Amino acid sequence: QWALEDFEIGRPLGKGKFGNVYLAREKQSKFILALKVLFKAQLEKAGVEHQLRREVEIQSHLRHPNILRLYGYFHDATRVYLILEYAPLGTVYRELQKLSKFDEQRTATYITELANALSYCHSKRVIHRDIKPENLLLGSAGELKIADFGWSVHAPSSRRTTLAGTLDYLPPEMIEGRMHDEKVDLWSLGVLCYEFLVGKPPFEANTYQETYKRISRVEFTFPDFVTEGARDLISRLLKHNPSQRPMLREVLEHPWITANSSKPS
Numbered sequence: 001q002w003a004l005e006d007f008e009i010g011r012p013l014g015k016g017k018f019g020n021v022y023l024a025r026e027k028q029s030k031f032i033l034a035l036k037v038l039f040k041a042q043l044e045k046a047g048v049e050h051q052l053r054r055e056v057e058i059q060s061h062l063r064h065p066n067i068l069r070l071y072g073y074f075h076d077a078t079r080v081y082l083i084l085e086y087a088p089l090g091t092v093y094r095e096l097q098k099l100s101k102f103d104e105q106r107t108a109t110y111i112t113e114l115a116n117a118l119s120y121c122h123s124k125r126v127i128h129r130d131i132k133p134e135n136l137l138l139g140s141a142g143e144l145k146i147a148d149f150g151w152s153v154h155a156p157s158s159r160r161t162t163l164a165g166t167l168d169y170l171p172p173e174m175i176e177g178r179m180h181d182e183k184v185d186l187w188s189l190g191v192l193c194y195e196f197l198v199g200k201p202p203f204e205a206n207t208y209q210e211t212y213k214r215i216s217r218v219e220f221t222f223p224d225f226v227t228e229g230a231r232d233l234i235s236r237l238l239k240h241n242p243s244q245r246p247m248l249r250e251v252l253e254h255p256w257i258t259a260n261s262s263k264p265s
């Protein structure tokens with residue numbers, strides 16, 4: 001159906017390990033969108049064809065205001081192209097670089113939006129497993145949208161693919177290669193809440209080997225400026241035992257969330 005010829009390409013929006021993402025406009029309709037380009041040679045070399053298939057299948061069927069739309073795809077014998085919803089206000093990653101730290105209202109609002117989106121995903125037993133600021137994008141009204149479903153699966157699951165970059169957002173059970181489920185995304189939600197308020201994630205360290213140690217032992221501390229309500233929510237999410245982590249409905253009804261979020265469940 002679609003082909004490269006149908007689009008005018010514009011400026012680079014961002015880069016990923018595999019993805020090279022561009023602004024684009026479809027010629028007949030003038031519809032503005034994002035084109036995510038993947039190189040077939042690099043896909044085959046890393047052996048991640050199944051992840052690409054998952055990304056397309058899972059993301060094209062989900063419909064939620066806080067989840068990024070995937071409209072389709074095409075390919076041309078060197079490249080694969082995913083057709084995505086364009087997020088005009090960029091990444092949460094960039095926004096944190098700009099401001100250093102978020103205040104409590106901003107943080108609580110982002111956490112509410114994330115919990116709404118994940119609750120929807122989990123009701124289909126879809127777990128994302130790669131929630132981190134570079135994969136959280138912003139819509140025209142500044143609302144958060146989860147993207148990059150390449151690592152997503154159906155629970156419960158093992159891990160069959162090599163971990164690539166940072167360990168910072170992953171729970172103990174996933175770094176230790178054990179069996180895991182939906183609770184992995186609750187752990188990541190805790191890591192994000194901390195990084196949003198403090199400016200760096202809680203198990204950050206100079207080497208892979210030391211980061212691993214801090215995560216498996218759940219060794220983190222709070223700066224003085226973090227309030228008691230924030231400490232309570234974050235301490236509840238960062239539990240070594242997955243079954244002790246709260247349900248998303250409990251996060252959405254936490255007193256700190258309800259006192260500070262500008263958006264509802």
Ligand SMILES: Nc1ncnc2c1ncn2[C@@H]1O[C@H](COP(=O)(O)OP(=O)(O)O)[C@@H](O)[C@H]1O
Nearest residue numbers: 013014015016017018019021034085087134148
């Ligand atoms: N729909 C989009 N709108 C705006 N920017 C995007 C969009 N998709 C991706 N980006 C930018 O491109 C980067 C890589 O996209 P991503 O889908 O995460 O690739 P990878 O799978 O390689 O991580 C993102 O971190 C973001 O900076």
Ligand SMILES: CCOc1ccc([C@@H](C)N)cc1
Nearest residue numbers: 040043044049052053056080
């Ligand atoms: C959803 C489509 O998935 C694909 C996966 C791999 C390839 C290439 C690498 N042979 C093309 C499509």
Ligand SMILES: [Mg+2]
Nearest residue numbers: 016134135148
């Ligand atoms: Mg990504």
Ligand SMILES: [Mg+2]
Nearest residue numbers: 148149150151
């Ligand atoms: Mg990916």
